[PDB]
Symmetry: D2
Subunit: 174 residues, 4 copies
């Protein structure tokens, strides 16, 4: 395995160490080499550092000058059909490796059966969620309406009336 | 008179291995502790080695009903943005909550185009994601090399913007008014 | 200055207006973030022995702890450093705390310390820490520090943080 | 053992895929058992990471087994890492690790011996990102630090005294007397 040397000796700095205190690890020119993940994990144990930290910032950014652009129907797109019933049409919006917590989706609602924000781009949307004391709460969101949802709140979005196809923008973040 | 949550103030004192008995000149009921002016509250802040803000952290009542906040179209704040004498945006707040003050969701009407001069913002510390709902949108942002970058987003396209990146959204076609959804978050 | 920065996040200015906090959908605490002046002397705060808060802890009529604040700063209200004198041993009954939301690390500066805590399955776990030994404790873990020998008063440093 | 293979927690990976409305089937070239998903080298894992628009570090987040025993970790004197510190041909510190846990890698607790004094030239550090608090357990400690606008400030800390240090503030601890060797406790965190 290959690890960014400048980053590794930055991690070693937090433990008041250098490349010296690593047992037989080949290195030269801003690169440190481990023979196997089990080897790196043993180094991870020794430094009392989780394995994930050794890759932090090692992935090349997918941004173009601090910006990433996605196109309609450009990324992942899927249909959700369970039991012959057409429910959703999933589509990824712009996703970046600079914020894995960010998940943006465009949803075409067809059927009548992390923090999150949801905006209704078209049609009437029927929203359910479990309030406190396990009370079944429901409401109808129309075009222009938006909703904020606290983490760990059971909720579902569907088409209000049926026949008419609705569309929402769902953003999950941190 | 200044009020501070009793349970929260006791929790603060608990960490410092203190109780309300270790605070002087303080009135209190079951829910709150009372101070004689902010000058009194400043002395106590000094005594506990604590910023004045900590007395009110988590003491704001939630605006969710419940765990959920719903906004209606044109239900919130709304204004026009004029930069350098140029009509640029038409801000409309989406749903806002005090459970996440770092979240700013907006619907914008673009009014400027290529026949108007460029008016970049200073950017913001908020991560931003923008979705185009209508029309064609010209986006310009300042790259790493201090140089200007540009692109065009059509209906359905989206863009992610790193914090503190100066940017501008205008109409690709002069005259035609486009619409976007701008979501700022932590 | 700070208010105009808070208003800027809502795309507002001073002439668009503590019910204000409710209207701006902003917690009351955020309007004070940064108002208190730093107590640091050029990025540093120094505290002397027996200078700050000092208290004796007597639980159930038995002398257990002697709390003494180390350096405290308004630049980190989550930091709580204490020097403790241990006065109780195992001939006096065991009295655990309720734990706390802060991560904690303790260092034995003198003597021998008997540490008890509630681990898995609500089981009472025990061990002994000598001078130079240390212990990390997860948040909300009920624990207790007493003398191992008894009479031989020990001393520890306990740091609480984020 | 196969050194080329990279193992990833199956439940964790599936959780990541679930957020992006995906299942394991949308990844073709992967073997897996009940507990883990296997990749043919780091080259393969980087392809899947880019496709998922997910940084390489996220595949291992929360997957490290805890070194705690019953929510507690105990260290002994001379039981862990121990190192000498010479900065400019000048013997300065003797680093000794206190208890270190992977449940808080930002927590670096040290017991230090002071070897330098007024006879030796000053050797400040460049400061660090971690907040720090120091407690004097023995001797008299001379502390120097770079204040605001690059002014040199000094003070003396005796047994029982403490000091808080803001992140990225250059500092140095030496023996006040000169000859007598002092001891301190340094706690770096978040
Ligand atoms: C200082 C700490 O470790 C013991 P307690 O004061 O929380 O009971
Ligand atoms: C005690 C501590 O300040 C030494 P260093 O952090 O400069 O290495
Ligand atoms: Fe903006
Ligand atoms: Fe404690
Ligand atoms: Fe330091």
């Amino acid at each position: 395995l290959a690890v960014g040397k400048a980053h590794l000796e930055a991690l070693l700095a937090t433990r008041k160490m250098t490349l010296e205190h690593l047992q037989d690890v080949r290195h030269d020119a801003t690169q440190v080499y481990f023979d196997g993940l089990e080897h790196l994990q043993n180094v991870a144990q020794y430094l009392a550092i989780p394995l994930s930290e050794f890759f932090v910032g090692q992935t090349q950014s997918d941004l173009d000058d601090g910006v990433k652009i996605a196109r309609r129907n450009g990324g992942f797109k899927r249909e959700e059909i369970r039991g012959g019933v057409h429910y959703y049409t999933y589509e990824h919006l712009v996703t970046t490796n600079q914020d894995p917590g960010l998940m943006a989706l465009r949803l075409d609602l067809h059927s009548d059966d992390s923090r999150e924000i949801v905006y209704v781009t078209r049609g009437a949307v029927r929203v359910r969620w479990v309030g406190d004391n396990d009370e079944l709460k429901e409401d109808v969101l129309n075009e222009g309406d938006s909703i904020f949802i606290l983490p760990n709140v059971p909720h579902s979005f569907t088409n209000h009336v049926g026949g008419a196809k609705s569309e929402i923008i769902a953003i999950n973040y941190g």
